[PDB]
């Protein structure tokens, strides 16, 4: 199925090169991966650690730091920010 | 006049040695020139021809090759990838 991201998340997606307003969840996550990578929000030495304090992503997550080994903050963000179509 | 490149473009800029996330349009083009040179996407025997098929740049432009004598491919990419600050 497809979803429409709330503007906050959509701005992040668009910055990542996402086209349009409708995506699948796997598309959204692919773009987020690119976002984190290119904006270098991760630790060079411990890549699974994301320090997003000071970025618009940190706001969406309502966090400063986290390992992607813990999807919990991620599920929360998706629920609040994806509208099923 | 400052601009902020969308991340697929920023990636190409950073690979050419650019630092940061904000630039002038002229800086963007000069880094793009550096990119094509260091990645050796040009034809040695026809240096104005760039063969970007299978490279980030090709995928960003949506083409296999182009002439730097015809900036129309570049205009399209710039419009879609630069956000004026």
């Amino acid at each position, epitope marked *: 199925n497809q979803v429409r991201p709330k503007l906050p998340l959509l701005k992040i997606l668009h910055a990542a090169g996402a086209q349009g307003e409708m995506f699948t*969840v*796997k598309e959204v*996550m*692919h773009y*987020l*991966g*690119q976002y*984190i*990578m290119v904006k270098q929000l*991760y630790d060079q030495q411990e*890549q*699974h650690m994301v320090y997003c304090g000071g970025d618009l992503l940190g706001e969406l997550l309502g966090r400063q730091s986290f390992s*992607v*080994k813990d*999807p919990s903050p991620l599920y929360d963000m998706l629920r609040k920010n994806l509208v099923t179509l | 006049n400052q601009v902020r490149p969308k991340l697929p473009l920023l990636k190409i800029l950073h690979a050419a040695g650019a630092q940061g996330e904000m630039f002038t349009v002229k800086e963007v083009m000069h880094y793009l020139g550096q990119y094509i040179m260091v990645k050796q996407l040009y034809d040695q025997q026809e240096q104005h021809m760039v063969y970007c098929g299978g490279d*980030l740049l090709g*995928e960003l432009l949506g083409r296999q090759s182009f002439s730097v004598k015809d900036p129309s491919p570049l205009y399209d990419m710039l419009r879609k990838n630069l956000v004026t600050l």
Partner: nanobody, 123 residues
């Protein structure tokens, strides 16, 4: 646009060896850690191994450690899995998976892309 095409699966006897391959496209392969995952009858997805983007660091499940060998050829956009001293326990559908998080090579996730798979039979 993401596409992952697994192959090299087939039918082998306990002790034999197969080489699986995965043809990746629709994304920048050279940027991504890549994963092998498998599904044996009656069971969910088991993470099998992973490899970092460059190809120098590799990870394995214990049930498969020191037996399978993961590798990649970035010039050919292809991932490989070398299954030696195959076991009956290894019969399953094998999938190549692209992680949503570019540096995740040690475990799979529900947001990953995988292909249609290749079937491995050991007996």
């Amino acid at each position: 646009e993401v596409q992952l095409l697994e192959s090299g699966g087939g039918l082998v006897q306990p002790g034999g060896s197969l080489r699986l391959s995965c043809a990746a496209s629709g994304f920048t392969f050279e940027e991504y850690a890549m994963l092998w995952v498998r599904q044996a009858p009656g069971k969910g997805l088991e993470w099998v191994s992973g490899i970092n983007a460059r190809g120098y660091t590799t990870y394995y499940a214990d049930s498969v450690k020191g037996r399978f060998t993961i590798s990649r050829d970035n010039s050919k956009n292809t991932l490989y899995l070398q299954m030696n001293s195959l076991r009956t326990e290894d019969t399953a559908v094998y999938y190549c998976a692209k992680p949503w998080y570019p540096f995740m090579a040690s475990k799979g996730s529900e947001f990953d892309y995988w292909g249609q798979g290749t079937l491995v039979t050991v007996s």
